[PDB]
Amino acid sequence: MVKFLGAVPVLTAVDVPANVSFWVDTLGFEKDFGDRDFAGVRRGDIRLHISRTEHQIVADNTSAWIEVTDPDALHEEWARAVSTDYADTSGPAMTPVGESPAGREFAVRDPAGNCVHFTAGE
Amino acid sequence: MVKFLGAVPVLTAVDVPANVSFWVDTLGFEKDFGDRDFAGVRRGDIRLHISRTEHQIVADNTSAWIEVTDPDALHEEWARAVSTDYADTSGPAMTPVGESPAGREFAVRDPAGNCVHFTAGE
């Protein structure tokens, strides 16, 4: 019986190195591998790939969900490095933590335009 | 210390219901939740979300990686339901299993255009 061990979302970016810097230097992920065309970052038990695209519209419409034990704690860690002005599409921003039927969560929009959601998980 | 438990890729599609049918009825995933705008499927320990997009170019440029214990076994299970003519972009297709420095893998292009890779994992 085939077992499904994990899934790796692929974020997209016109400028991969700049986006990798954000995830690593600002959000605290570690660089796994990569170059300007395809890179990978990781933190804890999860990994994320970042692929180069020639179309900004693709990056602005790419998203991913990540399950963490404590969304609030993570939000607090980043509150000092990321703008809380989500409406300000001028750059990366983070939303407030909110309650949903599925638990607390918040989202981060990286410099490339990807929207990544962080939700409470088990 | 915040723990990262899992990641959920988000596939995109102009026709979400048609894509969900493919993942569930053809690839054997189970329907978690959803409607025509946003749905979720799952198999084993992993989940995938499918979001509606108005731009086909986004779907054709969306991808994801999934780690499984045995790529060949999975490929064999699907060899009877999916076309092995990847070049035939007329519809869903699957590539042969190939060897990479990171192990054996293959890819599937679903009806919506997303490209999902299945690689050997631990």
Contacts of B48 in chain A (CB under 8 A): 7
Whose tokens are 């440029």? That residue is B61
Nearest CA to A22 among A46, A2, A44, A50?
Answer: A50
Distance CA A105, CA A45 (A): 19
- Burial class of residue B47 in the structure, from the number of CB atoms within 10 Å of its CB (0-12 exposed, 13-18 middle, 19+ buried): buried
Which tokens sit at A61?
A: 């419409």
Nearest CA to A6 among B48, B75, B115?
Answer: B48
Whose tokens are 């979400």? That residue is B16
With beta carbons less than 8 A apart as the criterion, state whether A121 and A104 touch: no
- Burial class of residue A54 in the structure, from the number of CB atoms within 10 Å of its CB (0-12 exposed, 13-18 middle, 19+ buried): exposed
The b-or-e profile of B6-26 (16+ CB within 10 A means b, else e) is bbbbbbbbbebeebbebbbee
- Which of B65, B77, B100 is most worth mutating to test chain A (most A CB atoms within 10 A of its CB)? B65
Facing residue for A51 by CB, picked from B8, B63, B73:
B63
Could you tell me which residues come within 8 angstroms of residue A52 by beta carbon, excluding any fewer than 6 positions away?
A12, A13, A14, A16, A36, A37, A38
With beta carbons less than 8 A apart as the criterion, state whether B4 and A65 touch: no
- Mind giving me the DSSP string for A21-85? HIIIIIT--EEEEE-SSEEEEEETTEEEEEEE-S-HHHHTT-EEEEEES-HHHHHHHHTTTS-S-
The b-or-e profile of A87-111 (16+ CB within 10 A means b, else e) is eeeeebbbbebeeeeeeebbbbbbb
Whose tokens are 């949903």? That residue is A100
Give me the CATH code for the B1-122 domain, please. 3.10.180.10
Work out the minimum CA distance from B73 to partner chain A, whole angstroms.
7
With beta carbons less than 8 A apart as the criterion, state whether A100 and B36 touch: no
Contacts of B46 in chain A (CB under 8 A): 4-7
Residue B84: how many other CB atoms lie within 10 Å: 12
Write out the H or E segment, with its range, that includes residue A106.
Answer: strand A103-109
Work out the minimum CA distance from A7 to partner chain B, whole angstroms.
4
Handedness of CA A43, A44, A46, A47 (dihedral sign): positive
Chain-chain contact of A3 with B48 (C-beta, under 8 angstroms): no
Could you tell me which residues come within 8 angstroms of residue B64 by beta carbon, excluding any fewer than 6 positions away?
A7, A8, A9, A10, B9, B11, B48, B114, B115, B116, B117
The number of C-alpha atoms within 13 Å of A45 and in the hemisphere containing its C-beta is: 17
Handedness of CA A23, A9, A17, B120 (dihedral sign): positive
Nearest CA to A108 among A29, A6, A33?
Answer: A29
| All structural domains of chain A with their residue ranges | 1-122
Distance CA B35, CA A121 (A): 23
Work out the minimum CA distance from B122 to partner chain A, whole angstroms.
7
Distance CA A74, CA A104 (A): 12
Resolution of this entry, Å: 1.5
Chain-chain contact of A2 with B73 (C-beta, under 8 angstroms): yes
B57 → chain A, closest CA residue: A58
Facing residue for A46 by CB, picked from B4, B10, B51:
B4
Experimental method: X-ray
With beta carbons less than 8 A apart as the criterion, state whether B47 and B41 touch: yes
Rounded to 5°, angle at Cα B90 from B106 and B110: 40
Rounded to 5°, angle at Cα A26 from A22 and A30: 80
Number of residues written out for chain A: 122
Rounded to 5°, angle at Cα A49 from B81 and B58: 60
- Mind giving me the DSSP string for B38-72? EEEEEETTEEEEEEE-S-HHHHTT-EEEEEES-HH
A75 → chain B, closest CA residue: B2
